[PDB]
Each structure stands twice: as structure tokens, then as C-alpha cells.
Design a protein around this ligand. Structure first.
Ligand code: SAH
Lengths: 39, 6, 18, 190, 361, 28, 65, 44, 167, 7, 134
RNA sequence: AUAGGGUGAAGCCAGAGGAAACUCUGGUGGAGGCUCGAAAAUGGAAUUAGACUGAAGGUCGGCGCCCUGGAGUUAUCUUUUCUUGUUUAUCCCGCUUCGGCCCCAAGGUGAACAGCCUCUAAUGUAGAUAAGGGAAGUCGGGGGAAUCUGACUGUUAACGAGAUUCCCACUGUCCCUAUCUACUCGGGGAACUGGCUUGUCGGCUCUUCCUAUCAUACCAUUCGGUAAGCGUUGGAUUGUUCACCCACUAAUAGGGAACGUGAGCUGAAUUGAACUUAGGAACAGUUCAUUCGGAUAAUUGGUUUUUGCGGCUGUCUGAUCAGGCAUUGCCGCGAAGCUACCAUCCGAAUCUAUAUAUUGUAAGCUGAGAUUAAGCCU
């Protein structure tokens, strides 16, 4: 049985969280080169 | 070749 | 309940349920 | 296509300017055509039976005749031009007559030209029929006007067998008695 | 399609074509050996003797002349006439005949060529089933010419149309050279199936095997060893169209064996998928024993007369019948372990207690 | 100077030119 | 000119009807319908299917001797 | 006996049960027993 | 004998004849040179029959009436049976059940399994001495001597004088 | 005969 | 050329580019079709071959000396159903052909498997080399 | 509000090697930048009982604090169906609401959060099928191998859901289209001929016309005359070009429609063979291909909303029986109809309509049972 919190999150926040995850992955991939990226 | 009208 | 079920079945067998 | 048939409009009437087309069947004949690669051999071919008295609700053998009839129509269809297709009047020439019923000199089966269960969309042939090699313009139940007029026209046709199987499906029997003798005894017939 | 000119194609006219025209080179292909030589340490400058087979109209010869030492011996061999070039000795003769051998020997007085580079190609348009094979044959002939004109540790460069007979050429090259490698320069437009293979370190054997350079058995075909397993389960699978010919020793295209051979064999799957029939002998004692069984009835014999119309449900029955027929026919060590374990546990407990003594600082 | 012209593609011996790929009148 | 019998259902085959398959084994299979041909292609056993004459002769439904 | 197999022949499924009434005009229950797409071939 | 004839401008006398059975054609020139018959509605009589008469199953009942039928895969009886009144060479792979219908010897003409088409005796020029009867060509270099002639020895017009002398 | 087109 | 007599129409079932088995013992395995002799003319229509029709083919699989150039071939088996004037539609297991010369003599010495009746009649050499007919 | 699935970090416990350190194997623990959803050319001056919505109509982790034992059906069967310290962690199995880190919400199935069910004539688009071939179409279409290329180790290294080329397999992309289901033609337009000129970019492919004729006709092949009736192809765009390469064919002739003109792509018959003439021809007699056109469905192949028969998967009618849903749910066959160069029939060269058969042995014996005209016969 699905929990209520899961039901709410999968219908209210799942899409934008996935979009943000994709955008973060794209930013990470596009920044692999570009010498001058130090911690 | 030979035609019909020939 | 079992007696009621048996009586209903017997009535239906004799076509008296209605 | 052909510019000689330029008017693609419907015919004036079903009687193109006489017999009723019944259907088609198949025959096999012993060919005697000297000089041909099929000399002294057997050839199977399509023939059309035209009923010439009909179950409608409304010449000699070894001779070539021409049939005048109205083409079967198919209605409007979209030379890259859209319009009437069919229902044209057409004359088809040099169609050899094969028979003027189904038993040949080689097939000893007392059977009639009518198939098992009759033709499709046409009953049994209860009257005289003209059996013409090939296909004639117009579909079944149409009226066809037969008319008179190469070694082909002089060939003598020796019929060997006529296909009288049911056209109403993949028939395998020539007579109902043959089917009854093949299958045997059924539950109903007891 | 459209029956258009080749010059009207989208990639036929290229920047390499115009670059070769500007540089005076007779073909854009001249750039290919320009880049290949730039990949393998400028091996033309260290050659000093050059042989170029099928060099119409001399683009590679021009490149060699511009790159190799000034007074080198670039010799071009062709089948079509070639426009003469300065400091290049070009002549016309078919390389697949003794005339080419005689002319080359006349021109190769005593020197042995340090490099042989071949760029031959047929008249493409036949169908590519013969074009690729005839190009491979041309490459093998060029190798046969080169093997007798190359010094030890020589370089041989050739162009092969990729096809089924390309790994065979690579293997043959590996048996006569130290390092064999294929490549494709940028000026080798990526729609083309041509690949340029270069091989360095010529072995130059004293007694070379002629049959290693004979096309009669270099291009020998390979047999098949398929499992023949789908023919028992997936009978109505519409097996892949058999367009690979028949067996050499097969004339009737038909096989039959005794049923007892099927019983005694170790591989029933292979025999069921190959035979057309199993023969029954009615005067054999083994078949006399096998006949009086609960099997060998209920449409079994009829399934044996034709092993091509059965299906899985009958093949399994036959296999079960074959199975039926085959069936018918110490304390001190433990104490030491305990002692060492007790010592280890005592040491660990002592260390843990000492550590806990000092974790309230 | 001989090595330079040899690199250009001029066959010369001490200096007279036997054969040059490019003209010597325009060679720098 | 001879009435053959279908390889599958043993029903008569007449000139023109059916399609014949020639195996590489120089064996001719004559069929009376596309039904029999399709049954043969799927490697269906004629004796198992009840409508064929092979089933009827292998179960005593019709005399065979 | 009404042969609804012949009368409804060629009609799309989605309108078989409604149109069936048109070839007749508790019987509505017998018409719609099997839904829109299902009408018995013969009815009494 | 020295007889030269063609069937419709074809030198292969053995293909269309055998002795005598003559193929049915569009003329009577071939028959007059020498039984009009067809085998399965074909003119190749010599390569579809054998005798000193065996016909395959492809022959119709009518043709068999016109002229013993054998049930065996290699329907080209004239190509797999080189026979005379006494000795008959056969195909190596022929079935046993028809050998009882045909002295029968399973042999090849120097590796040629078609004994009835490469041997007529005259055998093809490629025949080795051990298997060898004279090895001689026919119809101007045709190694197929069984089908290129019959043996009277009727042969195609294209036969050269030395070849006819050998025959 | 196909008559030509006169000027 | 080299065919004996006339020919009738058979259902075309082998267009250009098709690959068929090699039924003679010349050392080849398959033949790849590149052209058809006397096919006709029509726009966008691929030339197609039937049994008994001489085509030009190349040996895709076989002895290297055999696949040196394009060569004539004759189709002897057809997988496409075709009509037989005796009154029967028929077809074979697979597409097969035999290598020959422009005059119609095969390079091999025997033919494996059944040979179409129509093909074994146009070409007397095929009838001589064939072991099985129909 | 910060959810869920998987993976399983420190730390802890039990074993083996080793002087330790440490490394292994098992469990536990539940963390994260871990992951997943000459000059031409048109002619010329969803309604009528049925159905639908289907409960999503400071912080974190684990342990401790809805199902089950009156009404409905009953041909047969069913006591049934609905409702009232020993801590898991090292320290001292559901739904709703002690220690590291810094707005409410039912049940059954789902060997997958998912999803499913229930209680309170023509045209166009999409989809499927199709004999033989298998990318022959077009600029260019499930596995294997090798090259080019991008961040970059210790063997032709590896890696990238990067690109290219070959091998095998498959395919309606094509030859060449045909059938079924659901919804549902604008063709066309809007620096001046002063009678010039000739013999010394598949960019327009339902077409029409010109002759300055390539072939066929008449006077082995060369030249020329009448002649426009008729016909003037399939592949490669894969290496090299100054522009072509390879075959079939009777031949694969040259041009105008302003540089043939823009919804798209960079750049009415025709012809060829075969027998005989005739052993390197022909007229006479005779038999057939190719192309084109007209028509037709006997057969062969294809197609199924007869949703005709039979099967299977999931689910629901208390269970068999008989049925419904899942856009033939997925399959096998297939009638009628339509249809195929994939089927058949016919054809001096000049002047009726249209906007018995099929499947396969029924429920409880049996080629049984079911369906058979709506465009079958009777
Ligand atoms: N069998 C053969 N023998 C000799 N030369 C051949 C040949 N086959 C093809 N050739 C020639 O080889 C040439 C290859 S193209 C030349 C490749 C090279 N880039 C260059 O320009 O020199 C073709 O033009 C062809 O004419």
C-alpha cells in the first residue's frame, strides 16, 4: 500500500524535482571541462 | 515489325 | 442462519422463494 | 489511358447497343494446335457461361463471337482525374464459343453445367447456355448482346472436363452424390 | 537515382578536390598518403626507393617526389597511359602478368624498394559483389609484386575495399610483416568503404611459401557448425531461406539411417534435424525386442517415415521412445585453535578496555 | 645554400642546376 | 488428367484447385485447399486433427481394410 | 422470430443495440442484455 | 552409321530421341530422319526414359497408354541409366527398389555420376585410362556424348569428320 | 500525309 | 540466346539483387543476380527473373577462381508459386540456378535436386545434366 | 512539503592469516556531491436497462507504546455473498496520526511505484495484415567487427546509449500495390526580334507540340530520301577525373512552352523471337514473348466488423454453463465482397445502380455443435 506522503509527493512535486535533477545533471556534464573549476 | 495497317 | 439458508434453498427447490 | 474511350460517363442503359450473363467456370481441353508448343497436350482455362433462354427477379460450337455489354460500375473514385468509373458500354471481339451439359466425352459424370448450389448471385442454368472462352464485359445478371463477326477461329474444341465445383467457397465436389459418397454417413442421415 | 552525372553529386566536389587543383596535384587522393605518411613518422622521407602500382595519373607519385629524397627512384606502374612527370619513371603494363615482372626487373637493376604503395581500384558499377572481391584480388597481386621487391623492414601501404574477404588479407599481411594496422585518413570521404592498411617490418623470408600468396586458397571459404536445435522445437518457424548452396558430397539431398543407429547414437538432436527417414529392419533381433512394446504404435511408425512434417509434439515423442529403448538395452588441532582464539580474544578485550579507559577526555 | 635548394627540390652540384621542380628565378 | 488426393485431408484434388509443393527430396505434395496447405506449413499432424480422413481411418470411424 | 443478424449486418458495434430497437419499432432489457455491441441474432 | 540430323536446329539428338521414340514437334523432318510421344508433356524424351522401357512417375496415364513406371527420385532415367541388352550402368545413389526393376552396376564415368548422359561404347574425353570403349568427343567438342548422339548412329549436323570417323 | 503548319 | 523454341509467361519471382542457390557441381554455392536477359522496359520496374530465364549472376560464395567475373546463369527452381498449363499451381523449396555460358552449356557436370519442367525443356543441356525433373 | 524503489558508508559483533598494523568471509548497522522513475515548336489568319468517475475520484532513521471466527442467488453445487544491557543499532514487515546529521482517503489483483476492476461512394490521418524478392526506394534504412573521434590506464587495452564503413538477420522503404477498422482538381491566374538564328541541378517526368529521325515501315553494315503513326530503360553516386562507370534493349535521337514556368530538395495498337522455307538469308505457311490499352474473378495468392467458427491471457458476474470489458485484448482458419503481371481473357508504320459453404467434434455419445445473405441457391 502506498503511503499518503508518497501519494502527495508523486502528484505535486515529482515533476519539478525530476526537472531540477535533469538540469543539475546537464550543468554538471557541461562543466566537466572548462579548466578553472577548483573547490 | 509489320503493323496492322501494313 | 444455517436453518434459514436451508429453508430458503428448500423453498427455491419447490419454487416458493418469491 | 486510351483516348478512344474518352467519355467516362455512365451508359444510357444496361442494354448496350441476346442473353443474360450467368457466371464463370473452368474447363480442361485436349489441345490440337499444330506448330504450338502445347500441341497434342492438355490445357486448363477459364470460360464464362451466359444464359440464353432465367431465375432473375425482373451460333455453333467452334465459332468466334463478340459480346457487347455495359461494364460493371464502381461509382465515383478520386490521367489523375476523378469521376465515374465503370458502367461503360464495351464491345469485346473474338471470343470462341466452347459449348452451345457438363459431361464431356472423357468425363462420364451425368451432371449439369450449373455448379454445386448454383452460381453466386445467379441460380441454376435451366435453359440453353453459351459457354465462351475468356471473360465478357459486365457482371452477373447483366444482359449481354451476342454478335457474329488466324488459325484460332478454325480450331476444333474437344472438351475434356468442366469444373462444376461450388463457386460459393473452396468447393471440392462435382455432384452432391459425390460429396455424400465421400464423407459417408452423417448423424442427421440415420 | 535519376541518371545524374557523378560530378553533380553532393559530396563528389570537395575541399580536397579544389585543394589538389590549387596545389597542382592530379587528385584529391594525393592528400590521403599525405596524412597517412604524417601518421607513421614520415616513412616516405626515409625510403629513398619508391614503387607505386596502379598510379593513375600519378598523384601519389607526385606526393612521393615532393616528400622523398631529391634523386629517389619513384617508379610508377599503370595499365592506362600516364602523363609524364619530372624525376618519375612511369610505364604502362598490367601488373597481373609476367610483362610487369620483366619491365620492373629491367628498371630494378639491383636496388630493392624500401616501400611499395598500392592504390588500385576497378571500374566501380558492376554491383559491389564483384568490385570488392576484384579489388581484394588486385591488392593480393600488388602484395605478390611487393614481396619480391621489398627489403627487410620495409613498408607496404595498400587500399582495400571492406568486404567479407578483408580479414583474410589482414591475416596474410600479418604473416609477412611485423606491425599491420588499418586506418582511414580524413580525405577518404566517410561514405566510402575504402580502408588504407599499412604494414611495416617486412620479414623477407629466405624460403617463402608461394601458396601463402596464391588466391586459389587464400580466399578459401569457411564451413558451418550450427547447432541444428531449432529444427526440433521450432519446426513451423519458416527457417531462414537456405541460399548457401548444398554439401559437396550430397547428390540426392536425402538421408536415411537405421532406427537402431538413432537409438545407439550420442547426439539425437543433430540426427533428428538432419535425417529424412529412419529405416526399420524386420529381421533384426534388436528390432524384434523393441517391437513388442507399448510404444511402436498409436501413430509412431508413420511419424518415422518422414522426419520433415512432424513438429515438436512428435519429435518429443520420438525422443522419449529413444530414451525408453536406451533404458531397455583432530582434537589437538581443535585445542590449538581454541587456545589461539582465546589468546586473540583476550588481546582484543584488553585493547578495547584500554581504549574505553581513554574516551572520556 | 645547397641544402636549402635541395629542400626546395633542386638537384645541383658544385653550383650548377641540373633539374629544379620550381623555377630558380623566383625561389627566395 | 487424373483426380489426385490431397496429402493432408485425402479429399479429391481437381485440375486447377489447390497448390502443389515440391520438396527438394523430389517429393510432390498435392493440396485441395489453402486450409490443408496452411495446416501442412504449421507442421500439424493430419491424424491428430479430427476433420481429416487420416484421423477417421486411424480411429475406426470409416473402414480402411 | 426476428432475424436481427441480417437486419443489423454491417452496422458498427457502437450503435448495434440502439439501432436494433429501430428494426423492432422488458424487451429493452433483452435488447441491451449484452451491451451496445452485443445483440442476439434471433429474438422471439 | 554415319547419319547426321538436327531437331529444330539442335544437335542434341539423344535429348529428343532414343532407340525409336521421337519427340512431338512442329514438323515431321526429325521423325522422317529415323513413335511420337511426350513424357510429362515434354519433348525431352531421351533424358526422361530408359530401355534396351522405363518411364518415371511424371508420365501421365495417357502418355503411358500411348507408349513400366518407376517411383524413384531421379526422374531423368536416361541420365542415370546407361544400358544395353546385357549390361546397365546406373547412378551410384539410385535406390535399391528400382535396381530390381532394371546386370546392374553402380559406377561413375571417371567421377561423372550421370552415366546415361556421358556414355553411349563411347565415353567422354575426360575419362581416365583406368576407368576406361573409347574416349572421344561428339558434335564438335561436346563432351556430353550420351545426349549428343544415339546408337544406326544418328548425330547432330555439327559433328566433324574425325569425330564421325571415331563413332 | 500530315500537312505542315503554314506561316 | 541458345534457348530451344518459344517460351510462355511464368510468375516473376526473382528481381535484381536476389540471391539463389547454385545447383551444379562447379564449386559455387550461391548466385547474386545483376541483370536479366530480355526482361522488357518500364519505368521504376526492377527486372525480374523466373525459372528457365537466363540472367547474369556473380558467385557470392564459392571457389575464388570461380568468382572472378560476372557470368550467365539459368534459374532452375522457383520459390514463387507459378501456374502450370497442365492445370496446377506449384512452387519449390528455394531459388536455385545453374552456371552456364552464353551458348547455354553448363560449367558443371551434374545438377543437384529437382529441376523445373519448363526450364529442363527450353535448354537441352539442362535436361542432359539434370538428375531430377519436377 | 522535503516522499518512494535500489544500492548498502562509518561503527559494532562472530571466524581465518599475520608479531602488530592490516587484509579477508558472514551478520548487523542505515549514510551520502550514490543512483531510478531553309526554319521550328497550343490552333491562326453513451445512450435506450446500459455506461462512466474508482478514495492520487532544525531535520532523519528503527525498534516500544482494514482482514477474519435482515436482503440477494439457487437448472445443478456451495453451513456461501452484502449489511447492522543482552539494545534491532555500542554503549555502561500495512495504511492515518533512544543517535547520527546541521486539508481526510475502502477492498481484490498487479511473481513491476505502475496500470485493471469494484463497495460507499471519394479524399486525408492513424492502426493492422500481405505471396516472391529483401534497401534494388531515397541525397541518406536485431546482433557482430573494424576505423574516425572526446575525457584518458597498465593490448587489436578499456570507456562513450559520439560518428563512419563492411558481415549476418528482419522488414510494404521499394518492385506494386491490395484489403479491413476508427475518426473525418483549385488544376490556372489574380540595356528592344528593324521577319534575329543554322554546315564549312531529375528543376518540374496526368500532358501537349516541333523535326533538324535513334529504332520500327518503304526506297552484317555505311550514306541519303519520304516519313512524328508508334516507341525512346534498369543500376553506381561507394577510389580517379578534363565527366563520366557497369548492363539490358529494336533503339535507349535532339529541342520550345523566355532561359518551361517557385507551396518540395543548397548544387490504338506496338515490338522481338520460334518452326518450316534451309544448312550463311528472305517472301509464302505456322507458333509465341515485350510494351500499351480495354475488361473480368473459374481457379492461385492477399485482406476480414459476417467480429463466422475455434483457442489463449488478465479480470468480473457466488461455482459450472452462458456472458461482459481490455479499441478483432492476443491468436488460427476463413466465406461473400474487393483485388493482383502475384490471377485470367481480348485487341511507306503516312492520310446489376449510386455523394451450399466456413470453422473444427458443442453443453451434459460426436465431421458433432455453431453461423449460413444482409449483394448465395432453393
Ligand atoms: N589491374 C590493374 N592493373 C594496373 N592498374 C589498374 C588495374 N586496375 C585498375 N588500375 C588503375 O589503377 C588506378 C587507381 S586510381 C589511382 C589511385 C591513386 N590515388 C593515384 O592517383 O595514383 C585506376 O585509375 C585504374 O586505371
Amino acid at each position: 500500500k502506498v503511503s499518503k506522503s508518497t501519494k502527495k509527493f508523486q502528484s505535486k512535486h515529482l515533476k519539478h524535482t525530476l526537472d531540477q535533477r535533469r538540469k543539475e545533471k546537464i550543468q554538471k556534464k557541461r562543466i566537466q571541462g572548462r579548466r578553472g573549476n577548483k573547490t | 515489325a509489320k503493323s496492322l495497317r501494313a | 442462519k444455517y436453518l434459514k439458508y436451508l429453508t430458503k434453498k428448500y423453498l427455491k427447490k419447490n419454487q416458493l422463494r418469491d | 489511358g486510351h483516348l478512344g474511350f474518352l467519355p467516362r460517363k455512365r451508359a444510357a442503359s444496361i442494354r448496350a447497343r441476346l442473353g443474360y450473363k450467368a457466371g464463370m467456370t473452368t474447363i480442361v481441353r485436349d489441345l490440337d494446335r499444330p506448330g504450338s508448343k502445347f500441341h497434342k497436350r492438355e490445357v486448363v482455362e477459364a470460360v464464362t457461361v451466359v444464359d440464353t433462354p432465367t431465375p432473375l427477379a425482373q451460333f455453333e460450337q467452334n465459332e468466334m463471337i463478340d459480346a457487347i455489354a455495359v461494364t460493371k460500375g464502381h461509382g465515383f473514385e478520386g490521367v489523375a482525374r476523378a469521376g465515374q468509373r465503370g458502367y461503360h458500354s464495351r464491345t469485346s471481339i473474338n471470343h470462341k464459343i466452347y459449348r452451345v451439359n457438363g459431361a464431356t466425352s472423357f468425363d462420364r459424370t451425368k451432371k449439369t453445367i450449373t455448379p454445386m448450389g448454383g452460381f453466386v448471385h445467379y441460380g441454376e442454368i435451366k435453359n440453353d447456355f453459351i459457354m465462351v472462352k475468356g471473360c465478357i464485359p459486365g457482371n452477373r445478371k447483366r444482359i449481354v448482346t451476342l454478335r457474329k463477326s488466324s488459325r484460332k477461329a478454325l480450331e476444333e474444341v474437344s472438351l475434356k472436363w468442366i469444373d462444376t465445383a461450388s463457386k460459393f467457397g473452396k468447393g471440392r465436389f462435382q455432384t452432391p452424390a459425390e460429396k455424400h459418397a465421400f464423407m459417408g454417413t452423417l448423424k442427421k442421415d440415420l | 537515382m535519376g541518371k545524374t552525372q557523378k560530378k553533380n553529386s553532393k559530396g563528389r566536389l570537395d575541399r580536397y578536390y579544389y585543394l589538389a587543383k590549387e596545389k597542382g596535384y592530379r587528385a584529391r587522393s594525393s592528400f590521403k598518403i599525405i596524412q597517412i605518411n604524417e601518421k607513421y613518422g614520415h616513412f616516405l622521407e626515409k625510403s629513398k626507393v619508391v614503387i607505386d602500382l596502379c598510379a593513375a595519373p600519378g598523384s601519389w607519385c607526385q606526393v612521393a617526389s615532393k616528400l622523398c629524397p631529391v634523386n629517389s627512384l619513384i617508379i610508377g606502374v599503370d595499365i592506362v597511359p600516364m602523363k609524364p612527370m619530372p624525376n618519375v619513371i612511369t610505364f604502362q603494363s598490367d601488373i597481373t602478368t609476367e610483362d610487369c615482372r620483366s619491365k620492373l626487373r629491367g628498371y630494378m637493376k639491383t636496388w630493392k624498394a624500401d616501400t611499395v604503395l598500392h592504390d588500385g581500384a576497378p571500374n566501380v558499377g558492376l554491383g559491389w559483389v564483384q568490385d570488392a572481391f576484384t579489388q581484394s584480388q588486385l591488392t593480393l597481386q600488388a602484395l605478390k609484386l611487393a614481396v619480391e621487391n621489398l627489403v627487410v623492414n620495409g613498408t607496404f601501404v595498400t587500399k582495400i575495399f571492406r568486404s567479407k574477404d578483408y580479414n583474410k588479407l589482414i591475416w596474410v599481411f600479418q604473416q609477412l610483416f611485423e606491425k599491420v594496422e588499418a586506418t582511414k585518413p580524413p580525405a577518404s570521404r566517410n561514405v566510402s568503404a575504402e580502408i588504407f592498411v599499412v604494414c611495416k617490418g617486412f620479414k623477407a623470408p629466405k624460403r617463402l611459401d608461394p601458396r601463402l600468396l596464391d588466391p586459389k586458397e587464400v580466399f578459401e571459404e569457411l564451413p558451418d557448425g550450427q547447432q541444428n536445435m531449432e529444427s526440433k522445437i521450432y519446426n513451423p518457424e519458416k527457417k531462414v531461406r537456405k541460399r548457401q548452396g548444398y554439401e559437396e558430397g550430397d547428390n540426392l539431398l536425402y538421408h536415411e539411417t537405421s532406427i537402431l543407429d538413432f537409438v545407439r547414437t550420442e547426439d539425437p538432436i543433430s540426427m533428428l534435424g538432419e535425417m529424412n527417414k529412419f529405416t526399420i529392419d524386420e529381421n533384426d533381433h534388436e528390432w524384434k525386442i523393441l517391437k513388442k512394446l507399448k510404444q511402436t504404435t498409436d501413430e509412431f511408425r508413420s511419424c518415422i517415415e518422414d522426419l520433415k512434417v512432424l513438429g515438436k509434439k512428435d519429435f518429443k515423442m520420438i525422443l522419449r521412445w529413444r530414451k525408453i529403448a536406451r533404458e531397455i538395452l583432530g582434537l589437538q588441532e581443535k585445542q590449538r585453535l581454541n587456545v589461539k582464539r582465546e589468546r586473540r580474544r583476550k588481546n582484543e578485550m584488553k585493547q578495547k578496555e584500554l581504549q574505553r579507559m581513554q574516551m572520556n577526555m | 645554400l645547397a641544402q636549402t635548394l635541395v629542400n626546395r627540390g633542386v638537384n645541383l652540384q658544385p653550383l650548377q642546376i641540373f633539374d629544379s621542380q620550381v623555377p630558380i628565378g623566383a625561389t627566395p | 488428367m487424373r483426380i489426385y488426393q490431397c496429402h493432408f485431408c485425402s479429399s479429391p484434388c481437381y485440375p486447377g484447385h489447390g497448390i502443389m509443393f515440391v520438396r527438394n527430396d523430389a517429393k510432390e505434395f498435392r493440396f485441395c485447399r489453402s486450409k490443408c496447405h496452411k495446416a501442412f506449413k504449421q507442421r500439424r499432424n493430419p491424424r491428430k486433427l479430427k476433420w481429416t480422413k487420416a484421423f477417421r481411418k486411424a480411429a475406426g470411424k470409416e473402414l480402411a481394410v | 422470430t426476428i432475424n436481427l443478424h441480417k437486419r443489423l449486418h454491417g452496422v458498427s458495434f457502437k450503435k448495434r443495440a440502439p439501432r436494433a430497437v429501430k428494426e423492432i419499432k422488458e424487451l429493452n432489457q433483452a435488447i441491451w442484455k449484452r451491451g451496445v455491441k452485443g445483440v442476439e441474432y434471433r429474438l422471439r | 552409321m554415319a547419319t547426321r540430323t538436327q531437331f529444330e536446329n539442335s544437335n542434341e539428338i539423344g535429348v529428343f530421341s532414343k532407340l525409336c521414340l521421337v519427340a512431338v514437334g512442329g514438323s515431321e523432318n526429325f521423325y522422317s530422319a529415323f513413335v511420337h510421344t511426350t513424357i510429362a508433356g515434354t519433348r525431352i524424351i531421351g533424358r526422361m526414359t530408359a530401355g534396351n522401357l522405363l518411364v518415371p512417375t511424371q508420365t501421365t496415364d495417357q502418355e503411358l497408354q500411348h507408349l513400366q513406371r518407376v517411383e524413384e527420385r531421379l526422374s531423368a532415367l536416361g541420365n542415370v541409366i546407361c544400358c544395353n541388352d546385357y549390361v546397365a550402368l546406373v547412378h551410384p545413389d539410385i535406390d535399391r527398389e528400382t535396381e530390381e526393376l532394371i546386370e546392374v552396376f553402380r559406377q561413375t564415368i571417371s567421377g561423372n555420376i550421370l552415366v546415361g548422359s556421358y556414355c553411349s561404347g563411347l565415353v567422354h574425353p575426360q575419362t581416365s585410362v583406368q576407368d576406361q570403349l573409347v574416349a572421344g568427343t561428339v558434335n564438335r567438342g561436346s563432351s556430353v556424348v550420351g545426349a549428343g548422339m544415339v546408337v544406326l548412329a544418328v548425330t547432330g549436323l555439327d559433328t566433324t569428320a574425325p569425330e564421325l570417323s571415331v563413332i | 500525309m500530315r500537312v505542315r503548319k503554314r506561316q | 540466346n541458345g534457348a530451344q523454341g518459344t517460351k510462355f509467361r511464368i510468375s516473376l519471382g526473382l528481381p535484381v539483387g536476389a540471391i539463389m542457390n547454385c545447383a551444379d557441381n562447379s564449386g559455387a554455392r550461391n548466385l547474386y543476380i545483376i541483370a536479366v536477359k530480355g526482361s522488357g522496359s518500364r519505368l521504376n520496374r526492377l527486372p525480374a527473373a523466373s525459372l528457365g530465364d537466363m540472367v547474369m549472376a556473380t558467385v557470392k560464395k564459392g571457389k575464388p577462381e570461380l568468382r572472378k567475373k560476372v557470368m550467365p546463369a539459368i534459374v532452375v527452381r522457383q520459390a514463387k508459386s507459378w501456374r502450370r498449363r497442365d492445370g496446377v499451381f506449384l512452387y519449390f523449396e528455394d531459388n536455385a540456378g545453374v552456371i552456364a555460358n552464353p551458348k547455354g552449356e553448363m560449367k558443371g557436370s551434374a545438377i543437384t535436386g529437382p529441376v523445373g519442367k519448363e526450364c529442363a525443356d527450353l535448354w537441352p543441356r539442362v535436361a542432359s545434366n539434370s538428375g531430377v525433373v519436377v
